[PDB]
Design an enzyme around this catalytic site. Structure first.
Site, PDB file in Angstrom:
ATOM      1  N   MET A 264       1.160  -1.319   0.002  1.00 20.22           N
ATOM      2  CA  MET A 264      -0.043  -0.107  -0.103  1.00 20.22           C
ATOM      3  C   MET A 264       0.870   1.102   0.218  1.00 20.22           C
ATOM      4  O   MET A 264       1.722   1.253   0.530  1.00 20.22           O
ATOM      5  CB  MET A 264      -1.057   0.341   1.614  1.00 20.22           C
ATOM      6  N   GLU A 265       0.146   1.955  -0.393  1.00 22.69           N
ATOM      7  CA  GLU A 265       1.263   3.344  -0.738  1.00 22.69           C
ATOM      8  C   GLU A 265       2.768   3.545  -0.535  1.00 22.69           C
ATOM      9  O   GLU A 265       3.293   3.616  -0.481  1.00 22.69           O
ATOM     10  CB  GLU A 265       0.701   4.440   0.336  1.00 22.69           C
ATOM     11  N   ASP A 266       2.544   3.156  -2.508  1.00 17.00           N
ATOM     12  CA  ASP A 266       3.349   3.426  -3.158  1.00 17.00           C
ATOM     13  C   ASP A 266       4.788   2.421  -2.558  1.00 17.00           C
ATOM     14  O   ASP A 266       5.709   2.914  -2.657  1.00 17.00           O
ATOM     15  CB  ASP A 266       4.174   3.961  -3.464  1.00 17.00           C
ATOM     16  N   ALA A 267       4.813   1.064  -2.853  1.00 17.87           N
ATOM     17  CA  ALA A 267       5.585   0.112  -2.549  1.00 17.87           C
ATOM     18  C   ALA A 267       5.193  -1.213  -3.794  1.00 17.87           C
ATOM     19  O   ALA A 267       4.048  -0.770  -4.178  1.00 17.87           O
ATOM     20  CB  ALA A 267       5.320  -0.598  -0.773  1.00 17.87           C
TER      21      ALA A 267
ATOM     22  N   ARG B 195      -3.590   9.296 -10.100  1.00 12.82           N
ATOM     23  CA  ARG B 195      -2.236  10.245 -10.811  1.00 12.82           C
ATOM     24  C   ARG B 195      -2.784  10.763 -11.704  1.00 12.82           C
ATOM     25  O   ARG B 195      -1.709  11.959 -12.447  1.00 12.82           O
ATOM     26  CB  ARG B 195      -0.736   9.122 -10.712  1.00 12.82           C
TER      27      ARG B 195
END
Ligand SMILES: [Mg+2]
Ligand SMILES: [Zn+2]
Ligand SMILES: [Zn+2]
Lengths: 257, 65, 101, 41, 56, 293, 42, 94, 101, 146
Positions: F3-6, F189
């Site tokens: 989660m959240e850019d991993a 994004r």
């Protein structure tokens, strides 16, 4: 339980298992990847390296060469593996490309299964000498020790009613890829022994005229190796490990109470 | 940097069919059948053979004794 | 705990220091621990709570018609720490199969 | 007539990069500084 | 008499430091415990003899 | 764990080669000539006093004080032993330095938190008249937890967990994914180009020709979708995937593509360091700065 | 010892000038020894 | 494969099974659901990095049989079942 | 991680493109880009993108979008500067106050 | 102004001379720039709607006959500064060439620079993402020198 071998190629096999279920096949599948042991190069002792590559890279490649593992000689179903060590040496000199078939073994039963693999290119005056060490290991500890692959799918049948406009194209499409089709006076039965990409023209009828039903208890397997073990043998060795693993558990249960 | 001897997802040897690929494609034989004519089923094995550069011949010329 | 630090995860670095003297150490554990800071002094509302997957997954779990078969229920109560006895009970829908709303 | 197509224009552009350099300004200006600009100062 | 948050922390902190330098402990047996964790169990039973002089 | 850019990376893929890279550094120990006439002299520092390290940190040096190649260096191991003349027998007198009157060490050591193996030891002359030695040391460095990966669109991320190959969901074919990306990052994004490249790599791998994607005159979007189907795949990029943990098809279709990533150099080996109690300033009394101090 | 720019070895020690006696250049490479070292292959 | 009992209670047993992975674990759990008396049977792997070799099982019965006895009969099923498949296999490639 | 405004901005118009309030004026003597006729205050000329991110932006429109995107970049690093100094003022003025018993 | 331009295209005078006519309602100025640091750009001259020098020369560019030095002398490519561009009504594609366009752009895909050209399909992303993506290509790890 009854089988139906679809095709046997050099070092691959596809079959249809019946009479089992979802849980058990994953026990089978995961075991072939992580349990069945092979031989692989553990460490390399360099004597001299004037080649165009770093010491680790050449060392790394030696570990990737699939080595013939004779299954009738030790115990591949044992929980405590044998520490028997084989020494692979080589002394080569440029110019020329160094192949895999040049490796010398200290025991005629363990040789590279595929002799045409390029290891490293040598130019003029560059000498290269090493003594690779091979041991037994399991896939869960390091991926170099992997015997092969297992992929399985649900065996489904697709009923395509003749009320659907241009149903004939499905027959034509199925025949081009080689899927068994049985036809009668109402619909066509397509057995999906491989992936079946439905065209977009028919996605608006997906549900109404066309519906898919799963056959409970029939899986299509695909096993392929690299030459270390015969593909007929992998399943045999795999099941014995499973059986042996479970048996120990009962012995441990009595030692608890 | 000589062709990866295994693919990166599917474990299957691949160096033994690089060279024979390259010389045959550099004569006009369309790639979409050469790859098919050899044992290359899935596309995961195929990406590593198509896109590669083998710079090793340029770098080898220079020396470090 | 990644709204209060205003951290993300693309390489941001954090430091950690360890207090030593017994008075200082005790003082840190009773007065600054995370659980005493779920509500923020700026506005009357919770600050430490569910993020992106936590919210979206919660919707799928509670929609009209999310019938989870017996095997899955059993498997997921053991994944969430909670520890219940033989009361999954009682199977709201048994038409197709015995299953849980 | 078919005007060109984009693709032929690409061949025109292509020539411009191969013949001269990508680093044109530092190289060309220094070559001019050697002949003309030295004797001038 | 209900403590405030700040007084609670101080009492534990003071009490913990005494436990290190000697000062016999009540029933707090288990297995190897830091001096801080020793003060927590003693306080949970309401036997801490330290009283807060309240300025009033 | 993504989660959240991993980003989650296939264990087997790391272990067969993907993204491996080597780090290089080189030291420049020279031979200063003081004006008084004295010189340095690279010799193995005689087991005496005045700056001597005392342990067997000098075991690796040869006879002339230059290492020979392929000797594993680590921690504060010495690369080249110098000996600089004090030039003033009475200048310092540091409360015990009156009796020994020997020779100052100053030997070049490798930085504290580095390791690896020496590669080349040059030796030559400078433009004046002295002898300088340049020694380079290389480092293996495998892509472990924390290294940064990012596509060429702006999806920056850190490796989150290196899960065993077996517990990975796979497609009704032989494909096993290498990188499992969080689905909350695409319609947030607005990088539609990422989705188009995924389909574009799948078509490109099957056909065999490389798709041309230059801005404004690139391959029209509709052709890649209309070719993907006739090659034998659902047009939308989605397939039927089986979850590798238990083993049952997910009741949805799971997207899959061929995206070109690239490993960035913010590697965790150069960020982590700890301080216990270090030497501080004397006149101002503040601790020091950086990893070299 | 030594080894130079695209040729053959040299003698050991030094006191004066370091030049290769044939290419007149002056840059040396310290040759690798002839020993054995254990490199694990992960 | 060592069994560390965490808690024992009336018709309830939770325990660690050292040395096992998802392979044997998953198989053992759904095999227990055929036994009608075992109401609940689950497993989990707390944090797979620090520990992914020891999971935690929980077995609950209805009182007419102990969990210890219930596992021994249940695990026996796998042995017999795997044996049948192996026999079919070998009697096929001919 | 949502906003209905960006899901619509992926399958419909992007809209106008502004810089701190006014529409796009900064350019050549009488026009924005050299691809339009001098003295055109029309919709398409003064920076209005008609195509979406799916269908794709044309060369004129793509350049207009860059003018609106540099705005967000510059600002975010500048707003932090004034905030940090401002906070130092109020901390060094109010840190003394306590609540007596 | 028409005289000097037409002279330059004929190759009679050195190619670094651009002339622009500022056009106020009651001011007339004519500028001639000959300095040393102006940033120019190549454009194809078009006359009467037909872009000058069609496939006859493209065949020769693809062949080994005329390089780029030969083109600018012949009179197809013109280096336009900012100042000369004030009077030019540049077109984009060869499809919209009415009898009004003075010049015609080459491949427009070269507008961006050397690192931002590495992103595939840049016209489909948001402006901030491209800035990040272009800026990250300058930090990747690879082989850049044999
Ligand atoms: Mg950050
Ligand atoms: Zn592959
Ligand atoms: Zn020489």
């Amino acid at each position: 339980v009854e089988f139906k071998i679809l095709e046997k190629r050099p070092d691959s096999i596809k079959f249809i298992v019946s009479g089992v279920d979802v849980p058990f096949a994953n026990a089978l599948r995961r075991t072939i990847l992580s349990e069945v042991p092979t031989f692989a190069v553990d460490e390399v002792e360099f004597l001299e390296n004037d080649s165009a590559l770093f010491d680790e890279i050449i060392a790394h490649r030696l570990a990737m060469i699939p080595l013939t593992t004779p299954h009738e000689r030790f115990s591949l179903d044992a929980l405590e593996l044998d520490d028997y060590t084989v020494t692979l040496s080589l002394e080569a000199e440029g110019p020329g490309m160094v192949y895999s078939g040049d490796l010398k073994s200290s025991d005629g039963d363990v040789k590279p299964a595929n002799p045409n693999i390029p290891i490293v290119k040598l130019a003029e005056g560059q000498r290269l000498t090493f003594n690779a060490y091979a041991r037994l290991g399991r896939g869960k500890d390091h991926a170099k020790w992997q015997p092969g692959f297992v992929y399985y799918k649900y065996l489904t049948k697709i009923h395509v009613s003749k009320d659907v406009p241009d149903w004939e194209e499905l027959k034509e499409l199925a025949e081009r890829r080689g899927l068994p089709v049985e036809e009668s006076d109402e619909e066509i039965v397509i057995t999906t022994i491989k992936a079946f990409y439905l065209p977009r023209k028919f996605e608006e009828h997906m549900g109404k005229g066309i519906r898919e039903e799963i056959v409970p208890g029939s899986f299509v397997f695909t096993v392929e190796t690299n030459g270390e073990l015969p593909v007929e043998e992998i399943v045999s060795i795999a099941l014995k490990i499973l059986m042996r693993k479970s048996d120990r558990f009962i012995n441990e249960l009595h030692k608890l109470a | 940097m000589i062709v990866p001897v295994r693919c990166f997802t599917c474990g299957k040897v691949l160096a033994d069919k690089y060279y024979e690929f390259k010389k045959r494609v550099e004569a006009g034989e369309d790639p979409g059948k050469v790859l098919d004519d050899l044992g290359v089923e899935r596309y995961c094995c195929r990406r590593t053979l198509l896109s590669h550069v083998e710079l090793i011949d340029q770098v080898m010329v220079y020396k470090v004794y | 705990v990644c709204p209060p630090y205003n951290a993300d995860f693309d390489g941001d670095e954090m430091n950690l220091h360890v207090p030593q003297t017994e008075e200082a150490q005790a003082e840190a554990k009773i007065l600054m621990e995370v659980q005493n800071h779920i509500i923020s002094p700026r506005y009357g509302g919770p600050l430490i709570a569910g993020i992106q997957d936590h919210i979206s997954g919660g919707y799928l779990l509670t929609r009209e018609g999310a019938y989870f078969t017996r095997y899955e229920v059993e498997q997921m109560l053991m994944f969430a720490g909670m520890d219940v006895n033989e009361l999954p009970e009682p199977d709201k829908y048994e038409n197709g199969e015995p299953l849980w709303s | 007539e078919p005007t060109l197509t984009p693709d032929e224009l690409w061949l025109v552009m292509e020539s411009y990069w191969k013949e001269k350099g990508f680093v044109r300004q530092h190289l060309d200006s220094y070559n001019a500084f050697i002949d003309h600009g030295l004797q001038d100062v | 008499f209900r403590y405030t948050r700040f007084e609670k922390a101080r009492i534990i902190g003071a009490r913990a430091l005494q436990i290190a330098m000697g000062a016999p402990v009540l029933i707090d047996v288990p297995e190897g415990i830091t001096p801080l964790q020793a003060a927590l169990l003693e306080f949970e039973k309401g036997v801490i003899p330290i009283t807060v002089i309240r300025p009033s | 764990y993504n989660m959240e850019d991993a980003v989650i990376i296939n264990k087997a893929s790391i272990e067969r080669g993907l993204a491996r890279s080597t780090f290089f550094r080189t030291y420049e120990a020279e031979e200063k000539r003081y004006l008084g006439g004295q010189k340095d002299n690279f010799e193995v520092p005689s087991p005496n006093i005045q700056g001597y390290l005392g342990e067997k940190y000098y075991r690796h040096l040869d006879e002339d004080g230059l290492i020979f190649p392929e000797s594993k260096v680590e921690g504060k191991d010495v690369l080249v032993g110098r000996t600089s003349p004090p030039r003033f027998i009475e200048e310092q007198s540091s409360l015990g330095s009156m009796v020994l009157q020997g020779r100052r060490e100053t030997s070049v050591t490798v930085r504290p938190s580095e390791k690896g193996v020496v590669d080349k030891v040059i030796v030559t002359e400078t433009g004046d008249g002295t002898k300088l030695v340049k020694v380079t040391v290389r480092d293996l460095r495998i892509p472990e937890l924390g290294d940064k990966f990012a596509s060429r669109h702006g999806q920056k991320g850190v490796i989150g967990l290196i899960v065993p190959q077996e517990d990975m969901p796979w497609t009704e074919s032989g494909i096993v994914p290498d990188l499992i990306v969080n689905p909350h990052g695409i319609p947030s994004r607005m990088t539609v180009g990422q989705l188009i490249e995924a389909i574009g790599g799948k078509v490109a791998s099957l056909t065999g020709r490389r798709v041309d994607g230059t801005a404004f005159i690139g391959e029209p979007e509709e052709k890649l979708r209309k070719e993907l189907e006739e090659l034998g795949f659902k047009h939308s990029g989605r397939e039927i995937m089986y979850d590798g943990i238990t083993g049952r098809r997910l009741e949805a279709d799971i997207f899959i593509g061929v995206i070109y990533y690239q490993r960035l150099h913010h590697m965790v080996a150069d960020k982590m360091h700890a301080r216990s109690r270090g030497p501080v300033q004397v006149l101002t009394k503040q601790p020091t700065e950086g990893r070299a101090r | 010892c030594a080894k130079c720019g695209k040729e053959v070895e040299l003698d050991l020690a030094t006191a004066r000038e370091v030049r290769c006696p044939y290419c007149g250049s002056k840059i040396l490479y310290k040759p690798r020894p002839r020993v054995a070292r254990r490199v694990k292959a992960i | 494969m060592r069994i560390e009992v965490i808690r024992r209670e009336e018709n309830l047993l939770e325990f660690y099974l050292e040395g096992e992975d998802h392979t044997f674990a998953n198989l053992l759990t759904e095999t227990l659901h055929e036994n009608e008396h075992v109401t609940f049977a689950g497993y989990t792997i707390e944090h797979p990095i620090t520990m992914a070799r020891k999971p935690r099982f929980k077995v609950v019965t209805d009182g007419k049989i102990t969990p210890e006895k219930a596992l021994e009969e249940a695990a026996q099923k796998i042995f017999d079942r795997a044996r049948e498949v192996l026999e079919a296999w070998k009697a096929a490639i001919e | 991680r949502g906003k209905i405004l960006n899901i619509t901005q992926m399958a419909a118009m992007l809209g106008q493109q502004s810089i701190r309030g006014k529409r796009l004026y900064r350019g050549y003597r009488g026009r924005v880009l050299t691809h339009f006729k001098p003295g055109d205050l029309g919709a398409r000329a003064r920076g209005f993108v008609t195509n979406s991110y799916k269908s794709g932006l044309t060369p004129q429109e793509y350049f207009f979008h860059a003018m609106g995107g540099r705005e967000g970049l510059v600002d975010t690093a500048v707003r932090t500067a004034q905030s940090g100094y401002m906070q130092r003022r109020l901390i060094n003025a109010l840190q003394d106050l306590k609540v007596d018993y | 102004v028409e005289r000097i331009r037409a002279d330059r295209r004929a190759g009679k005078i050195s190619d670094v001379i651009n002339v622009a006519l500022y056009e106020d309602e009651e001011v007339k100025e004519v500028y001639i720039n000959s300095d040393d640091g102006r940033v120019r750009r190549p454009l194809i001259v078009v006359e009467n709607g037909k872009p000058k020098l069609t496939r006859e020369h493209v065949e020769g560019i693809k062949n080994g006959t005329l390089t780029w030095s030969d083109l600018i002398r012949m009179g197809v490519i013109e280096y336009l500064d900012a100042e000369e561009e004030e009077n030019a009504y540049v077109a984009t594609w060869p499809w919209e060439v009415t009898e009004e366009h003075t010049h015609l752009e080459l491949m427009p895909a070269a507008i961006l620079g050397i690192p931002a050209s590495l992103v595939p399909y840049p016209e489909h992303n948001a402006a901030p993402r491209n800035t990040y993506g272009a800026g990250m290509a300058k930090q990747s790890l690879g082989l850049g020198w044999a």
